[PDB]
Amino acid sequence: SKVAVIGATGRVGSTAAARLALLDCVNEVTLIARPKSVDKLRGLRRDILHSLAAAQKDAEITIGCERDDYVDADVIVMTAGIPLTKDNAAIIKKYLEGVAEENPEAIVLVVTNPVDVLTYVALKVSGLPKNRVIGSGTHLDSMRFKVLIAKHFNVHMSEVHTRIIGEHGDTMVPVISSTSVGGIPVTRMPGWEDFDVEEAVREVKEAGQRIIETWGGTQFGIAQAITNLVRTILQDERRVLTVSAYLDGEIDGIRDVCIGVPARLGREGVLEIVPIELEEDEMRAFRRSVKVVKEATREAMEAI
Amino acid sequence: SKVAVIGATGRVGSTAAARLALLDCVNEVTLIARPKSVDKLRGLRRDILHSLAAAQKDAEITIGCERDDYVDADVIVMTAGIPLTKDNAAIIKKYLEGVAEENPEAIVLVVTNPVDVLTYVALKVSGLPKNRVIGSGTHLDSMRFKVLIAKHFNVHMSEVHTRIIGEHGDTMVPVISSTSVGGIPVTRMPGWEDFDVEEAVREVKEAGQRIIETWGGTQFGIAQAITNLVRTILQDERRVLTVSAYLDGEIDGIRDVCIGVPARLGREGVLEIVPIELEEDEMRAFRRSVKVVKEATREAMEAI
Amino acid sequence: SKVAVIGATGRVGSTAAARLALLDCVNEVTLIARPKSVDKLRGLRRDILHSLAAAQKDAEITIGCERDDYVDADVIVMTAGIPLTKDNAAIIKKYLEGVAEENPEAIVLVVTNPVDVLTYVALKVSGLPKNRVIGSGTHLDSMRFKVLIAKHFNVHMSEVHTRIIGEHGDTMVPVISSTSVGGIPVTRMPGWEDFDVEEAVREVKEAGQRIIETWGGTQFGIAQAITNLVRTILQDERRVLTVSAYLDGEIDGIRDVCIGVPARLGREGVLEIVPIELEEDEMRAFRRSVKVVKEATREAMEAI
Amino acid sequence: SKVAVIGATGRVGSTAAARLALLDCVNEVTLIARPKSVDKLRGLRRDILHSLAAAQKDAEITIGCERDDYVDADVIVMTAGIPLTKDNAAIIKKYLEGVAEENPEAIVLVVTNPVDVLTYVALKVSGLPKNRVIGSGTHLDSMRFKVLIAKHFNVHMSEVHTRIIGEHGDTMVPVISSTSVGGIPVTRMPGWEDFDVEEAVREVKEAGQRIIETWGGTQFGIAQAITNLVRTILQDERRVLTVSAYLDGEIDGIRDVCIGVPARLGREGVLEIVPIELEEDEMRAFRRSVKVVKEATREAMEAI
Numbered sequence A, B, C, D: 001s002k003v004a005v006i007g008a009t010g011r012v013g014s015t016a017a018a019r020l021a022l023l024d025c026v027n028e029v030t031l032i033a034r035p036k037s038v039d040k041l042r043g044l045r046r047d048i049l050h051s052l053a054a055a056q057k058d059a060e061i062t063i064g065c066e067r068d069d070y071v072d073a074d075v076i077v078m079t080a081g082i083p084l085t086k087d088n089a090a091i092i093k094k095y096l097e098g099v100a101e102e103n104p105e106a107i108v109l110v111v112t113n114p115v116d117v118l119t120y121v122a123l124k125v126s127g128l129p130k131n132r133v134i135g136s137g138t139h140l141d142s143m144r145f146k147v148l149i150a151k152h153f154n155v156h157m158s159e160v161h162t163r164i165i166g167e168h169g170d171t172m173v174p175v176i177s178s179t180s181v182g183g184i185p186v187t188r189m190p191g192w193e194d195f196d197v198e199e200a201v202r203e204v205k206e207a208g209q210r211i212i213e214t215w216g217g218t219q220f221g222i223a224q225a226i227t228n229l230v231r232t233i234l235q236d237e238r239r240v241l242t243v244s245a246y247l248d249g250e251i252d253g254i255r256d257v258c259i260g261v262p263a264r265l266g267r268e269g270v271l272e273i274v275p276i277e278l279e280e281d282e283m284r285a286f287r288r289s290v291k292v293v294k295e296a297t298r299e300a301m302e303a304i
């Protein structure tokens, strides 16, 4: 498999490329940047190759700054952007416009924030099928919520299944109705009352801003999440993950929006959107999140 | 960690010892048999050591036929017996009686059938704490039910959590109320109606007899299951697994019986018994299974 | 990839199939036996599927008793035979004769003893390329010799590279000239004088007889070795292993014989035979072993 | 085990900590920086915990800016310094002076360049045993040289054993006399003549400058190397690696210097220094490198 990383000079692009070459299913990683940063990509290329030697893993690292260098990749990772919607939306247009004409079987993974809005932009400008364009969305938010619950019940992480749907932002929605420990609904689990869901969600929603103001931004957490998504797709693992995808009325008839939703992912991208049944309160928060994401998408498309 | 395998000359003992030495957490495996089969254990010792060399793994393989050779082990696996209750119950008495006096921190894993009944016998004769004596029970039955459901929904196996409680036999009880795919109750999952639970359970309950009449008995399936249980305990993984354990009124006030139940397992054995809430029908089948196991336990203890 | 195991009903066939289905690169394992053992193979199929469920791994297990069931396999493992040369030579002819006509891209690995002689038989009757027919040979013997050396120097096993070439029998030849620890020739390694080469070779060459008279035969060591060889080929790993291969004058001009030699192995079978340079004594032992293997092969071919 | 990283705010400290927490043998990672960078370390702690959640791995991440926060660690990694010898020598003294008084069983790995010189400084100021203070040295340089050789012969990387001893700089010395492929001396290996040793050494020694002028510095290669060394020590793997260690006359009677040499590494640090035998030319280059490292170390000690 060949994976291109656009924005490899950045904090997220460099880290994600380094850990992506360690995957056995990734035979080639192509580093893409603007023409004025190709020299920087040469240094990163040797750095990554040195790390592969240390790990006794193999991968071909290439560099490019043109459309022909990454359009034929199996998976294209979009990590380039300013760390709002207006500026990053143009960058998506520059790189992904018309990709379907050349490689109609491409899969695009969008990391640039706003991830939900820019997934819609990428799908529209690219012309690819709706199942082949996705974004990281709330995947990492769901994973960290999973750890918090597991520690509360003092169980192995694999025992906890949970999810955060909606926008990768303040309008995210934890789905308690579909949270389980060992298959047991968490509501019926002893000790659930002592778990402060509201406090835990606040940790999830605010950790992004705290990391930015102190460290500068997320590099390792997001890069590992991208590794999870790419490995799942390229190995056709068919896991139900929470990614930003185009809704076409599978959940409450809500359609024409890209937002974090449960999706069974494989080599063909989004095989299907799981039609989860939400409770009253969860549905109300989900609808509020969808309305917020749709208005932002309106602004982005106008800027394009 | 040191693990002793009593009955290493048999189909289950030999296979389980071979795969147990491959675990990184298993530094020594002691092969225990009757004095008239020590010579056979010498051949098996070199065979296993040859396999470790092929796998580039390390482990010390010892042999013994006396109490002093295995009483100080961290985990003792009881695979010796005829492949009913009366004959195998005496064998449990011979090897495990009084083990608490010498090593009170021992953990006993019982595989000899009837596993549920013989777990009670082993706990009584050994004098160990009720949390340090367990049996394989319905762990493998739950794992195979897990695979059948995963293939039905065409999802990764890790997405499916399910369980079979009760006797390792005809009175086993699948717990649909605590079965989930991605955290979603399977009842709310689209396509659940097309899954034939009754047919699938019949496959689980009868595969044992079909294997016996054709191949002779289970060797690889059960041996791998034992590897799962021992790895979980020695690495303190704290997974919720289905093993035969002593109930003391955690489920519906049913007490004084050993039967397959959900249990969080760690280095200390059964940390706790998950107090699952069952539905009407599931509770009725569970009570029928408990009554059957209790009568069999009555016969066994009398024989001792 | 699909791997067929002829003789799956046996000790070596059953065990090798069980561990081969655990490899991620093996998607299907076909169990082949004589027609009067199909029912036994049904039980072995259910047992192995139980182990896969316990290990959370996936593979399709098929059953067959006809040529059409295994001729299209990528790798065919020959474990069927009496546990000599005359009787087993006929068995090889029955199964492998003309295989090139149907699947010319097949790879045959021969385990039935005499392994070197029957590797020659399989190549002749099959009509396959000389690089697509090999045998286990001295791979496991070299592996155990490697462990003994590593323990002597108290170093990690990966640090020791060594090999035993020639017949898988009494005429095997350890190659000290090409034995190294960390890249340092073992002769120059401190403590090499305290290593009793004669004692170590005695343990390796006789362990087969010791195991047979007590346990019955080699089961786990050989099964793991088959897993090693098949994984190496199917993943095109290009490791230098000691397998029985057809010599065409790469070592001292010796040709027209199958015997254990260093060979770089990949998806195309034997990519090349390493032209090792032997010392005087080592070469004389190699010629003695070749003489024994050639005479035995002549007798086998006469039996047809 | 607990591993402390001094300089976690830097490119090497942050990256090394992120990959060190992924090791199963590392239960705690402590991030150490100057007091004015504690807030930045808080963000790095949250980011790394996010990566652990994504990777389904567990580890406790702590923060500190005082000696008491890291003196009781099992392994202390020194990545703090200006990216020469005079300024960095003071930094080493501040952190490691007197560490033996509090935790005499600590192991110090020095990464700050000049690595060889500062390894000597750390050993002197700490008062620790000569076997408990080491440096990264030429481990990564040897690893990349190993990959280049493997690609030339088109063999698996595990088949190549090689090392570069001496200074981690322009006076490094490749040891062809102790380079082997599959146990065969590389000089006797077919195709060795087509290998341009001078070209390969040029790539290894200069890649550091090439990376610095474009990317800024080494980040991923060195971070992975630290993970390699720490895992080797904490799991008592007994691998022969090339690290900066105190020579006491094991190689040509050269003593009173820290420089890259083959060393068998375990939980006790440097178990022993392999007394490699060098050829005429290789030994002369080794003496030249020792002369350079000794003069630089003299200058450093004067700076205190």
Ligand SMILES: NC(=O)C1=CN([C@@H]2O[C@H](COP(=O)(O)OP(=O)(O)OC[C@H]3O[C@@H](n4cnc5c(N)ncnc54)[C@H](OP(=O)(O)O)[C@@H]3O)[C@@H](O)[C@H]2O)C=CC1
Binding pocket: A006, A007, A008, A009, A010, A011, A012, A013, A033, A034, A036, A037, A079, A080, A081, A082, A083, A088, A091, A111, A112, A113, A114, A115, A136, A217, A218, A219, A222
């Ligand atoms: N999923 C999440 O929650 C997270 C998402 N992100 C998103 O990733 C994006 C960048 O993150 P980060 O990499 O940390 O920011 P950086 O500034 O560190 O990296 C910026 C990248 O974008 C490229 N770039 C900037 N402007 C342009 C342009 N006009 N045309 C083409 N390429 C351009 C840069 O190339 P050059 O080297 O030439 O500048 C560089 O590769 C942001 O949108 C951020 O929100 C990041 C972290 C967390």
Ligand SMILES: NC(=O)C1=CN([C@@H]2O[C@H](COP(=O)(O)OP(=O)(O)OC[C@H]3O[C@@H](n4cnc5c(N)ncnc54)[C@H](OP(=O)(O)O)[C@@H]3O)[C@@H](O)[C@H]2O)C=CC1
Binding pocket: B006, B007, B008, B009, B010, B011, B012, B013, B033, B034, B036, B037, B079, B080, B081, B082, B083, B088, B091, B111, B112, B113, B114, B115, B136, B217, B218, B219, B222
């Ligand atoms: N969990 C499950 O569902 C399964 C459980 N099992 C149970 O495992 C047990 C044996 O399985 P298997 O190993 O296939 O049967 P085998 O007969 O193949 O192995 C029998 C073992 O028991 C030992 N043994 C027999 N009689 C005595 C005795 N009187 N005193 C001491 N040791 C004795 C044998 O030693 P010697 O070599 O001297 O005979 C041998 O080690 C049975 O109880 C069977 O039900 C097995 C498969 C599946």
Ligand SMILES: NC(=O)C1=CN([C@@H]2O[C@H](COP(=O)(O)OP(=O)(O)OC[C@H]3O[C@@H](n4cnc5c(N)ncnc54)[C@H](OP(=O)(O)O)[C@@H]3O)[C@@H](O)[C@H]2O)C=CC1
Binding pocket: C006, C007, C008, C009, C010, C011, C012, C013, C033, C034, C037, C079, C080, C081, C082, C083, C091, C111, C112, C113, C114, C115, C136, C137, C140, C168, C217, C218, C222
């Ligand atoms: N290092 C090595 O290379 C080693 C190789 N081996 C070899 O492995 C082979 C099998 O060992 P093992 O499996 O223990 O012996 P088993 O008798 O236990 O297994 C015999 C297998 O051969 C099959 N078989 C027997 N006779 C015939 C026949 N006439 N035609 C076709 N198939 C037949 C049987 O099938 P059914 O049940 O239908 O008869 C069964 O699957 C032996 O040749 C042995 O030498 C073993 C150890 C070391």
Ligand SMILES: NC(=O)C1=CN([C@@H]2O[C@H](COP(=O)(O)OP(=O)(O)OC[C@H]3O[C@@H](n4cnc5c(N)ncnc54)[C@H](OP(=O)(O)O)[C@@H]3O)[C@@H](O)[C@H]2O)C=CC1
Binding pocket: D006, D007, D008, D009, D010, D011, D012, D013, D033, D034, D037, D079, D080, D081, D082, D083, D091, D111, D112, D113, D114, D115, D136, D137, D140, D168, D217, D218, D222
């Ligand atoms: N193969 C090898 O051995 C290699 C080693 N290295 C070495 O790694 C070291 C760091 O490289 P890098 O991390 O990229 O450089 P950075 O400047 O990116 O990181 C510098 C680190 O040093 C700390 N630091 C700087 N000045 C002082 C001081 N006066 N007292 C205490 N701590 C201080 C900083 O902490 P703060 O943010 O608080 O200042 C920061 O954590 C360098 O010495 C470099 O030579 C690098 C490449 C190869």
Ligand SMILES: [Cl-]
Binding pocket: A138, A139, A142, A143, A163, A240, A241, A242
């Ligand atoms: Cl998710």
Ligand SMILES: [Cl-]
Binding pocket: B138, B139, B142, B143, B163, B240, B241, B242
């Ligand atoms: Cl279970």
Ligand SMILES: [Cl-]
Binding pocket: B015, B018, B019, B220, C015, C018, C019, C220
């Ligand atoms: Cl096995």
Ligand SMILES: [Cl-]
Binding pocket: C138, C139, C142, C143, C162, C163, C240, C241, C242
């Ligand atoms: Cl080999």
Ligand SMILES: [Cl-]
Binding pocket: A015, A018, A019, A220, D015, D018, D019, D220
């Ligand atoms: Cl990283």
Ligand SMILES: [Cl-]
Binding pocket: D138, D139, D142, D143, D162, D163, D240, D241, D242
């Ligand atoms: Cl090294």
Ligand SMILES: [K+]
Binding pocket: A021, A022, A023, A024, A025, A026, A027, A057, A058, A059
């Ligand atoms: K790779």
Ligand SMILES: [K+]
Binding pocket: B021, B022, B023, B024, B025, B026, B027, B057, B058, B059
């Ligand atoms: K082990």
Ligand SMILES: [K+]
Binding pocket: C020, C021, C022, C023, C024, C025, C026, C027, C057, C058, C059
């Ligand atoms: K498989």
Ligand SMILES: [K+]
Binding pocket: D020, D021, D022, D023, D024, D025, D026, D027, D057, D058, D059
């Ligand atoms: K860890």
